[PDB]
Amino acid sequence: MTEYKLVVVGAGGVGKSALTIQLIQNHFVDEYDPTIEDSYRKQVVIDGETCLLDILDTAGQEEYSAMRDEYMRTGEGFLCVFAINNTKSFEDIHQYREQIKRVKDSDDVPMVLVGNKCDLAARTVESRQAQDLARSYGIPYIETSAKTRQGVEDAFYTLVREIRQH
Ligand SMILES: Nc1nc2c(ncn2[C@@H]2O[C@H](COP(=O)(O)OP(=O)(O)NP(=O)(O)O)[C@@H](O)[C@H]2O)c(=O)[nH]1
Ligand SMILES: [Ca+2]
Ligand SMILES: [Mg+2]
Ligand SMILES: [Mg+2]
Numbered sequence: 002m003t004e005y006k007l008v009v010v011g012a013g014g015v016g017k018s019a020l021t022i023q024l025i026q027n028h029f030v031d032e033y034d035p036t037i038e039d040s041y042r043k044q045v046v047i048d049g050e051t052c053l054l055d056i057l058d059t060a061g062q063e064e065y066s067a068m069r070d071e072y073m074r075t076g077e078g079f080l081c082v083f084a085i086n087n088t089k090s091f092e093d094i095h096q097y098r099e100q101i102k103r104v105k106d107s108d109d110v111p112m113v114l115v116g117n118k119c120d121l122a123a124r125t126v127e128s129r130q131a132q133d134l135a136r137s138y139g140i141p142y143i144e145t146s147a148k149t150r151q152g153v154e155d156a157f158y159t160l161v162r163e164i165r166q167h
């Protein structure tokens with residue numbers, strides 16, 4: 002069957018692990034354990050196609066971000082995640098995109114910009130700002146909550162549909 006290699010990147014604490022765990026395991030991780038590099042695999046049907054998702058959950062913490070570029074160059078599509086209540090994580094996005102362009106050696110890499118923690122009221126990044134950033138990259142913007150599950154499937158499946166247009 003078709004395998005899609007997805008990689009989730011973004012600043013420490015924005016909810017990369019929680020998103021992935023909600024998608025694959027259907028529960029919300031409330032605690033914060035910083036990731037080094039973890040892998041998840043799951044067979045799913047997306048738009049009628051049975052396929053295998055291989056998801057790399059990467060470190061956001063600079064202290065844990067060793068050899069991240071190595072694990073990443075194998076990725077086919079990337080979720081670039083920031084948190085809507087963390088302005089710095091949004092500002093950090095451009096540098097994750099640059100890293101991806103480097104590891105893939107291409108300006109045309111399947112990506113989705115994800116604004117996570119949309120269940121939270123302390124918003125400092127407005128939807129329109131994120132829409133504009135995504136538009137400049139030529140990619141979708143989707144808001145998610147790993148807590149409520151809002152947009153979680155949408156984000157990952159959209160990433161798959163982006164790889165498919167590639
Ligand atoms: N309210 C809320 N909290 C969230 C959401 N996603 C993650 N969190 C919380 O934010 C914290 C960090 O989440 P985590 O998934 O560990 O972040 P990470 O990006 O994987 N961190 P790291 O880069 O260090 O591995 C946890 O306490 C988690 O419960 C969300 O959508 N809503
Ligand atoms: Ca929990
Ligand atoms: Mg993590
Ligand atoms: Mg390179």
Ligand SMILES: [Mg+2]
Binds near residue numbers: 125
């Ligand atoms: Mg503002």
